[PDB]
Amino acid sequence: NLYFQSHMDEILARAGIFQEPSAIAALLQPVDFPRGHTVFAEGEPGDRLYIIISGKVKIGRRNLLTIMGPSDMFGELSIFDPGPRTSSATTITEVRAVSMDRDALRSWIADRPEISEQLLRVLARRLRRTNNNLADLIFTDVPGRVAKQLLQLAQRFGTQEGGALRVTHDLTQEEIAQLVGASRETVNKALADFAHRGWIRLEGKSVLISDSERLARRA
Amino acid sequence: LYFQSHMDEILARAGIFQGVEPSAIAAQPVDFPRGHTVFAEGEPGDRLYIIISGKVKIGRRAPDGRENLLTIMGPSDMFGELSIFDPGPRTSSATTITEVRAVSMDRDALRSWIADRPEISEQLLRVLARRLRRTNNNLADLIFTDVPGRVAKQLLQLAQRFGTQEGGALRVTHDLTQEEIAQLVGASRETVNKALADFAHRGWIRLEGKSVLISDSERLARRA
Ligand SMILES: Nc1ncnc2c1ncn2[C@@H]1O[C@@H]2COP(=O)(O)O[C@H]2[C@H]1O
Numbered sequence: 001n002l003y004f005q006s007h008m009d010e011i012l013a014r015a016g017i018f019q020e021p022s023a024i025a026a027l028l029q030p031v032d033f034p035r036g037h038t039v040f041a042e043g044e045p046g047d048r049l050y051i052i053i054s055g056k057v058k059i060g061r062r063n064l065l066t067i068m069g070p071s072d073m074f075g076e077l078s079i080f081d082p083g084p085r086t087s088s089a090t091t092i093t094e095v096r097a098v099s100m101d102r103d104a105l106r107s108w109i110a111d112r113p114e115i116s117e118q119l120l121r122v123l124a125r126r127l128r129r130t131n132n133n134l135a136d137l138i139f140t141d142v143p144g145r146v147a148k149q150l151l152q153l154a155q156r157f158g159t160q161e162g163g164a165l166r167v168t169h170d171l172t173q174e175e176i177a178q179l180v181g182a183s184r185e186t187v188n189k190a191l192a193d194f195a196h197r198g199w200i201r202l203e204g205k206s207v208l209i210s211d212s213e214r215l216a217r218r219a
Numbered sequence: 220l221y222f223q224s225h226m227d228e229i230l231a232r233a234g235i236f237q238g239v240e241p242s243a244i245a246a247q248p249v250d251f252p253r254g255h256t257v258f259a260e261g262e263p264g265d266r267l268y269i270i271i272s273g274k275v276k277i278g279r280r281a282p283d284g285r286e287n288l289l290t291i292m293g294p295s296d297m298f299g300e301l302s303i304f305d306p307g308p309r310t311s312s313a314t315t316i317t318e319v320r321a322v323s324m325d326r327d328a329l330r331s332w333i334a335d336r337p338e339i340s341e342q343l344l345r346v347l348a349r350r351l352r353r354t355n356n357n358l359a360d361l362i363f364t365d366v367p368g369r370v371a372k373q374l375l376q377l378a379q380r381f382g383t384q385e386g387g388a389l390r391v392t393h394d395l396t397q398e399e400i401a402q403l404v405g406a407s408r409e410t411v412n413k414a415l416a417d418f419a420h421r422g423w424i425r426l427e428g429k430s431v432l433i434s435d436s437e438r439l440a441r442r443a
């Protein structure tokens with residue numbers, strides 16, 4: 001949007017930290033990570049929140065909890081509740097990010113208290129989503145969870161093509177079973193069954209979802 | 220009048236106020252019987268509650284009418300805030316498991332408080348960051364921990380929140396049926412009763428109504 005003075009501002013605008021836009025351009029210092037870079041590891045002191053400008057970061061534990069992309073914030077939980085990193089954050093593509101420490105965020109919030117309401121909103125949403133993932137681990141079979149994960153990654157990283165619907169997740173198969181919490185083998189067969197069925201085509205780092213309806217039904 | 224102070228004490232413990240002072244924010248009371256659905260998953264919601272006394276289970280029903288419980292709320296815990304901060308349907312039901320006294324507030328009341336007192340926002344973020352961490356642990360326990368490990372863990376979490384000292388032992392007054400405990404742990408009732416009987420047979424706990432008396436917390440902690 002040539003409405004914002006920077007792509008940075010557009011994505012930060014989409015992250016929620018604003019709510020304009022010559023004023024927005026009072027913004028922070030970027031950082032570029034290579035692919036495969038562990039931005040921080042689980043259990044480390046956490047003094048820093050990041051917001052992704054471009055690229056994807058996986059969040060993992062010991063299970064992958066989520067794949068984040070442009071405008072997604074990570075590293076906030078140890079800023080809001082001081083203590084060790086709850087998970088590792090590793091880049092699965094090259095990533096440009098902006099970051100800020102607890103002092104900087106507090107001055108950001110003092111300056112615009114409204115930002116706190118947007119941060120609560122994002123947290124509440126993460127809670128909602130995580131609740132659903134847990135309820136899936138309890139109430140849904142493996143291929144049902146595979147189907148859920150494909151349609152989740154779609155809603156965030158999906159591009160209409162035809163359509164439908166290309167989802168370029170940038171994940172290996174290991175990485176997709178880790179999102180679903182099942183064996184690579186159990187997830188391998190669910191994806192082959194869906195591909196056989198005609199509902200998806202499977203092309204390395206992206207799935208062409210041709211039949212979103214029946215995928216959704218399989219949940 | 221001693222009850223008022225009581226109430227002030229319990230409510231001053233609420234996570235939302237841990238950065239306030241007083242605190243006479245505080246003066247909308249509501250009383251509920253046991254087994255009252257305060258609200259139902261998917262219902263429209265514009266109101267949060269802080270418990271003064273009693274307990275409330277947070278639950279989701281599956282398609283096949285099965286349920287799990289996400290958490291149990293007690294004195295000074297806040298529920299119903301997620302549809303205030305992210306406007307839309309209740310993400311779960313809130314059902315009272317004993318008689319409950321609470322006070323509540325709507326989206327607009329809370330937003331005045333925040334504008335007035337931003338230290339409230341920071342505490343609300345802390346409580347939510349904490350619920351998220353806990354929920355990640357729960358979700359991971361479901362993938363990687365065995366049932367008796369989850370049972371022991373669950374007894375000790377409940378002890379942190381609802382534990383009282385009786386001499387050298389910790390009384391955990393959970394107020395839950397065996398079915399509710401199993402739903403909280405996310406395993407069958409029989410698998411969960413067996414874990415509980417083992418622990419009891421070994422002298423670590425005593426099952427005494429809707430309470431556990433934890434007579435050897437060191438041993439129970441080592442079991443998870
Ligand atoms: N359930 C979740 N959903 C999305 N992101 C998460 C979840 N749990 C943890 N994270 C992210 O992982 C980060 C790890 O570092 P922090 O604990 O500082 O902050 C955490 C969040 O940004």
Ligand SMILES: Nc1ncnc2c1ncn2[C@@H]1O[C@@H]2COP(=O)(O)O[C@H]2[C@H]1O
Nearest residue numbers: 290298299300301302309310311350354
């Ligand atoms: N994982 C969780 N941990 C603690 N409390 C929760 C969790 N999920 C839902 N809740 C509470 O349950 C409430 C249901 O209604 P709301 O979604 O408005 O607000 C919700 C939270 O207060």
